[PDB]
Design an enzyme around this catalytic site. Structure first.
Site, PDB file in Angstrom:
ATOM      1  N   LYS A   1       0.774  -1.168   0.314  1.00  0.00           N
ATOM      2  CA  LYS A   1      -0.227   0.260   0.159  1.00  0.00           C
ATOM      3  C   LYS A   1       0.872   1.547   0.218  1.00  0.00           C
ATOM      4  O   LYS A   1       0.436   2.198  -1.176  1.00  0.00           O
ATOM      5  CB  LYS A   1      -1.265  -0.233   0.953  1.00  0.00           C
ATOM      6  CG  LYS A   1      -1.813  -1.105   0.516  1.00  0.00           C
ATOM      7  CD  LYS A   1      -2.907  -1.180   2.117  1.00  0.00           C
ATOM      8  CE  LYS A   1      -4.454  -1.915   1.969  1.00  0.00           C
ATOM      9  NZ  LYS A   1      -3.905  -3.057   1.753  1.00  0.00           N
TER      10      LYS A   1
ATOM     11  N   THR B   1     -19.787   6.943  13.994  1.00  0.00           N
ATOM     12  CA  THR B   1     -18.668   5.968  15.084  1.00  0.00           C
ATOM     13  C   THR B   1     -17.963   7.620  15.965  1.00  0.00           C
ATOM     14  O   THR B   1     -17.525   6.977  16.971  1.00  0.00           O
ATOM     15  CB  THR B   1     -17.565   5.416  14.632  1.00  0.00           C
ATOM     16  OG1 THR B   1     -17.054   5.547  13.490  1.00  0.00           O
ATOM     17  CG2 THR B   1     -18.359   4.571  13.427  1.00  0.00           C
TER      18      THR B   1
ATOM     19  N   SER C   1      -1.436  11.992  30.592  1.00  0.00           N
ATOM     20  CA  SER C   1      -0.622  12.794  29.551  1.00  0.00           C
ATOM     21  C   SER C   1       0.131  13.656  30.868  1.00  0.00           C
ATOM     22  O   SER C   1       1.251  14.499  30.286  1.00  0.00           O
ATOM     23  CB  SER C   1      -0.666  12.917  28.438  1.00  0.00           C
ATOM     24  OG  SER C   1      -1.410  13.322  28.790  1.00  0.00           O
TER      25      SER C   1
END
Lengths: 102, 90, 323, 97, 80, 93, 110, 96, 83
Positions: C62, C91, C170
């Site tokens: 690809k 979604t 984080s």
DNA sequence: CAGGCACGTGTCAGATATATACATCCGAT
DNA sequence: ATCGGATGTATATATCTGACACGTGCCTGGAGACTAGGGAGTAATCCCCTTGGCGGTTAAAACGCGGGGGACAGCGCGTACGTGCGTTTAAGCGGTGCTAGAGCTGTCTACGACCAATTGAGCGGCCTCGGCACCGGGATTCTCGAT
DNA sequence: ATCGAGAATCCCGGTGCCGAGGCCGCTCAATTGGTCGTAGACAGCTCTAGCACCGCTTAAACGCACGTACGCGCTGTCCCCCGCGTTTTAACCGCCAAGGGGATTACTCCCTAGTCT
């Protein structure tokens, strides 16, 4: 794998796959392959114990089909479980009727 | 390429470590295990069909083993199978 | 350098997750995109990505097709597919996902407008995700998230001074921005072998001071909801943000803080160090590994420094837990 | 000269054939018989060697079991020499006819 | 192929009967055992050839033979 | 309940063959059991024979093979002939 | 929507091809069932039942009765040389056995 | 003082019990035997009447077959009286 | 509750005689009755064990006739009629 | 989609039979 | 006595494995909170179907006894079936040499698996009258004792 | 090789009886178009193992000659079961209680393939 999880040496995955593809019922429960694996392991262990005990006689360190036929025919219950089956080049257990003998 | 060779060899090593098994007897064991598995599975399947239940469970195979094998082998096998399934449960 | 390749892998991962019901293709594509984005060279061929461990045959082909043509025929085809693109777009809504995406597209619901017109077909979690679609997709600047930490800590100590709350993630690692809020809470009266309400008072008083405004799900140990910083009443109101609060037993609180502090590569590196040193570490506890591999009883944990000490590893600040 | 009592070398030979596990039937005549009995059902069909061996093994097992049972019947008849009456009765009582 | 039936010989029947466990053999045993062997063999071959015909192949297989054996109660081990 | 049987069917077959004969209830149940037994036997043989050849379905070919297997000579020959005529008449529609 | 005709009438049989199809479906013998399989099996069952009742009807007719009872059925099944072979492992309720006496069992006469 | 020759009344009842088709065993003793054998395994069982009828006439069929084969064995030995040794022959060579 | 005992003798001598007459025998030796009773007891035990196991399946306390004809079908009898 | 890996498949020193010469007990006459 | 043959030991073939490396489809994915629904277990009836007594009623089991036919020994021929020794015949074995079909793989496409409406064929109630189970007499047939 | 004198065993109607078989109402599962999905049908390609042929070698099969030992055949004894009265007895035959469990119906819990962390 589940065989290690169930403490068994026969493949639960393979017998579950066979129950899927053998087409016995539309769905198969979780404990069915495990319980079959345990049963088959017990039967195979019994057969091999009897065969090894027979091979201890005749000073043969290697299992022969004659040994297997002898072990099957010597036992009482295993004789009836495998009554209608013949073992290839297995022979028959020694037996002579009393009237024939002098 | 279905075979049970490695498993029956492991069982033999576990029971009798010092004894080897020839190829012909190996095939005989393969046929024997296939025969027993087919017989138990077929009995369990028809037993599920008579009771109108659509799935095979541990109970139905337990009953099939109880019918097919003779007495003391049947009781030993059902004890070992119940032990194995209750081990797998936890 | 390689932004296009990583973007295409991200899009393919999104299509695999949302359209294909293939979580593992999505994971493989995201892992490939991550390892490619960290490669400090402009990729010249798919084979070049293939020599290093990671990228497989399909991704290499690809990449090669992109380098030859500038696109993927399959990706271009799936981009213009109304059903697949509609599913992928739907979604993105918090709560509206693959199952909902297929069902909605099958019944004609493909855009946010149809979702708003079909409110009765959405549960509370999907409705709130639809309400804050724009707000949820925004990142949180570190100053606003410092302010939310301040508010959360004042409210928590207002509930009871014996509580211990830590903002992990984080932010604890010192990143300048995070996508959501993660708070871990504990109380000395709550251990693994010991109230079903300890989360409830903190949640209720956060409702009372109008910090958290929506509830997505709430139980005795886990709360996920939506919160928003109070407005000055003369400046633009702050966007709504996602907040999760996890109640963990005291004997597992520091293990949970270590887990939720990360980072993920740091997590696996520490886990492998523990495993190769004879310990098993999970989100909850730390256990020994025997000579036969049998895990033992959990060891007492009273700090992150303790966990670092058991694995004979120098305590690393969360700022230094990038990997 | 030194001759054996009738039945003595018969007993030696019965022991030597009951201990071992041969085939006891010459392979080529059995294979020719199988080919000659199979051509009635289908003309010009091939045979795998293992199929012929399996047929021989099955025939051996069937015949040896039948001979054991018919010997048992003959000994039941207060008689030691087997006659075909015994074989057909052993077949009939086992349901094969 | 003509009188292959006579291919199996009288001493072969005698040895087989010895393995069966018998002492004395009449004269008429040989014809009767040839007949019963022929009928058993044709009973097995009929089912084996039927299986082969269903498989659209022109050669039998030992697997077909053991299947035909299992069909009529004479289960066979050692061939699959 | 909703018990099913082969009552209507066997009665019609008998009236087709013997116009002036009746069936007692015990004999009728015996015929029902016979029909069920033969159906189960043939279907099971066909199922097994389909499973060997790696096929995934039961069709006229393996049922014909099954009735050639379980049925002996004359009965098998006439049953195969009747079945194949019937299936040809059916597929001719 | 034409006037529906049952498939057993289309094949010209008496036993239902539909019921046999249903039993094959939910009997779990194969994943899929072909179209000709139930009609073939129904025709086979027709032939077997026809043979049984023809023999039983003859056995009732020559016994001066006009209704088949289990005795007639068992006599018809066990009297034929090859129909017996199909059903040699079966017992029939209230069936009885054929009258047969061995020759030596008869008196020596003279 | 007219007595039939021995054996003749045997053949004519042979005709009777081969011509008729009743049960030949009383129902109640058979039911009691079945219940005894059942409670040997496990207790508190109830039987439908069709079940005990099934056992009764299946048992009749089995015993009829056994005596038929036993008669064959007896006639084989140039003898008309069946003794148990014939029964063990029939059981043994039948395969049970 | 009323434990049954001593019923094998309930199968009377004339019953065995009648079954033998149906079988086709001319005369009966005096001591085959005990052997026949033993043969019958073992056969009933073999059938009843399977029937009772079938009835234990499905948690049913009553033994019907359909499960026992299934048990007979197991042992190569395949009873027709009942069920 | 990517790894990990458990069975399946060749390939050779060596346990494991295996057939061939005497001594000994048994076996029948 | 007496002349020969099946088992214990050496001892050189031989031989068929078991551990050891490749290959390639299985195989589990890795940690867990929900989450809104499907099979399965559980409680609550309905009634019917089995079990337990209850007393007549008698067919059938229990028992005894004479005696006659068959089970069982015992003896005697005698011919059918074991041994034993040429010999000869076809089986094993080991090459060759073809080539028919067993088995594998790649396209499609024509069957079957679901699935809503629809209806008609089959299942339960429900009579009702006739095939057949008894039932004494009256001839027929079968069997045993004399002679 | 007969007759004669009794015991079984089919033909005469009648007697009635309960179940075999139409008939009706109901209902649910075959049947009829329609869609998709994929399982074999059908082709083409290997390649292998099965048939055919030849020679060499030798062990088993076949034929012939004897010896004798099981198999029948015939008597001879006796004992054991059979046929047939007597004398119990337990199986039937209804005739009810009665209650326990096997089907149905509403309610609630493992599981379950994701859904997301």
């Amino acid at each position: 794998t589940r065989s290690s999880r169930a403490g068994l040496q026969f493949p639960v995955g393979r017998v579950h796959r066979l129950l899927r593809k053998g087409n016995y019922a539309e769905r198969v429960g979780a404990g069915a392959p495990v319980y079959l694996a345990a049963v088959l392991e017990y039967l195979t262990a019994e057969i091999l114990e009897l065969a090894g005990n027979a091979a201890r006689d005749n000073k043969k360190t290697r299992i022969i089909p004659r040994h297997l036929q002898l072990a099957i025919r010597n036992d009482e219950e295993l004789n009836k479980l495998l009554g209608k089956v013949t073992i290839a080049q297995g022979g028959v257990l020694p037996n002579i009727q009393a009237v024939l003998l002098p | 390429k279905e075979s049970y060779s490695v498993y029956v060899y492991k069982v033999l090593k576990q029971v009798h470590p010092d004894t080897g098994i020839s190829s012909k007897a190996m095939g005989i064991m393969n046929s024997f295990v296939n025969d027993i598995f087919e017989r138990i599975a077929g009995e369990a399947s028809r037993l599920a069909h008579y009771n109108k239940r659509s799935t095979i469970t541990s109970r139905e195979i337990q009953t099939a083993v109880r019918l097919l094998l003779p007495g003391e082998l049947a009781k030993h096998a059902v004890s070992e199978g119940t032990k194995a399934v209750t081990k797998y449960t936890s | 350098l390689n932004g296009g390749i990583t973007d295409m892998l991200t899009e393919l991962a999104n299509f695999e997750k949302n359209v294909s019901q293939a979580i593992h293709k999505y994971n493989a594509y995201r892992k490939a995109a991550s390892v490619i984005a960290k490669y400090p060279h402009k990729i010249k061929s798919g084979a070049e990505a293939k020599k290093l461990p990671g990228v497989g045959t399909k991704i290499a082909e690809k990449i090669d097709e992109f380098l030859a043509t500038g696109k993927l025929r399959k990706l271009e085809k799936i981009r213009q597919d109304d059903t697949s693109s509609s599913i992928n777009f739907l979604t993105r809504v918090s709560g509206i996902g693959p199952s909902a995406a297929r069902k909605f597209v099958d019944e004609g619901i493909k855009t946010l407008e149809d979702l708003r017109k079909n409110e009765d077909k959405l549960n509370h979690h999907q409705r709130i995700g639809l309400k804050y679609f724009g707000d949820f997709e925004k990142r949180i600047p570190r100053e606003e998230m410092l302010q939310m930490q301040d508010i959360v800590l004042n409210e928590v100590k207002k509930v009871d001074s014996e509580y211990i709350a830590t903002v992990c993630g984080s932010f604890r690692r010192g990143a300048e921005s995070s996508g959501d809020m993660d708070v871990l809470l504990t109380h000395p009266s709550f251990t693994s072998e010991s109230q079903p309400k300890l989360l409830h008072q903190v949640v209720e008083q956060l409702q009372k001071v109008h910090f958290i405004t929506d509830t997505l799900s709430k139980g005795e140990t886990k709360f996920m909801g939506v919160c928003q910083l109070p407005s000055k009443n003369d400046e633009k109101e702050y966007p709504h943000r996602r907040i999760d609060i996890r109640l963990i037993p005291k004997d597992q609180y520091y293990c949970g803080v270590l887990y939720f502090t990360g980072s993920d590569i740091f997590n696996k590196n520490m886990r492998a160090h523990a495993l190769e040193k004879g310990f098993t570490i999970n989100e909850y506890t730390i256990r020994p590994l025997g000579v036969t591999g049998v895990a033992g009883e959990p060891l007492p944990v009273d700090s992150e420094k303790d966990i670092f000490d058991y694995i004979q590893w120098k305590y690393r600040e969360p700022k230094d837990r990038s990997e | 000269p030194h001759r054996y009592r009738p039945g003595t070398v018969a007993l030696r030979e019965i022991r030597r054939y009951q201990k071992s596990t041969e085939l006891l039937i010459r392979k080529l005549p059995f294979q020719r018989l199988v080919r000659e009995i199979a051509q009635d059902f289908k003309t010009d069909l091939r045979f795998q060697s293992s199929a012929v061996m399996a047929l021989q093994e099955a025939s051996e097992a069937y015949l040896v079991g039948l001979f054991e049972d018919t010997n048992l019947a003959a000994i039941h008849a207060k008689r030691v020499t087997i006659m075909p009456k015994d074989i057909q009765l052993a077949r009939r009582i086992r349901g094969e006819r | 192929l003509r009188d292959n039936i006579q291919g199996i010989t009288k001493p072969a029947i005698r040895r087989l009967a010895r393995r069966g466990g018998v002492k004395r053999i009449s004269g008429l045993i040989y014809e009767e055992t040839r007949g019963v062997l022929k009928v058993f063999l044709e009973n097995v071959i009929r089912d084996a050839v039927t299986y082969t015909e269903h498989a659209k192949r022109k050669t039998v297989t030992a697997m077909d033979v053991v299947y035909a054996l299992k069909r009529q109660g004479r289960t066979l081990y050692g061939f699959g």
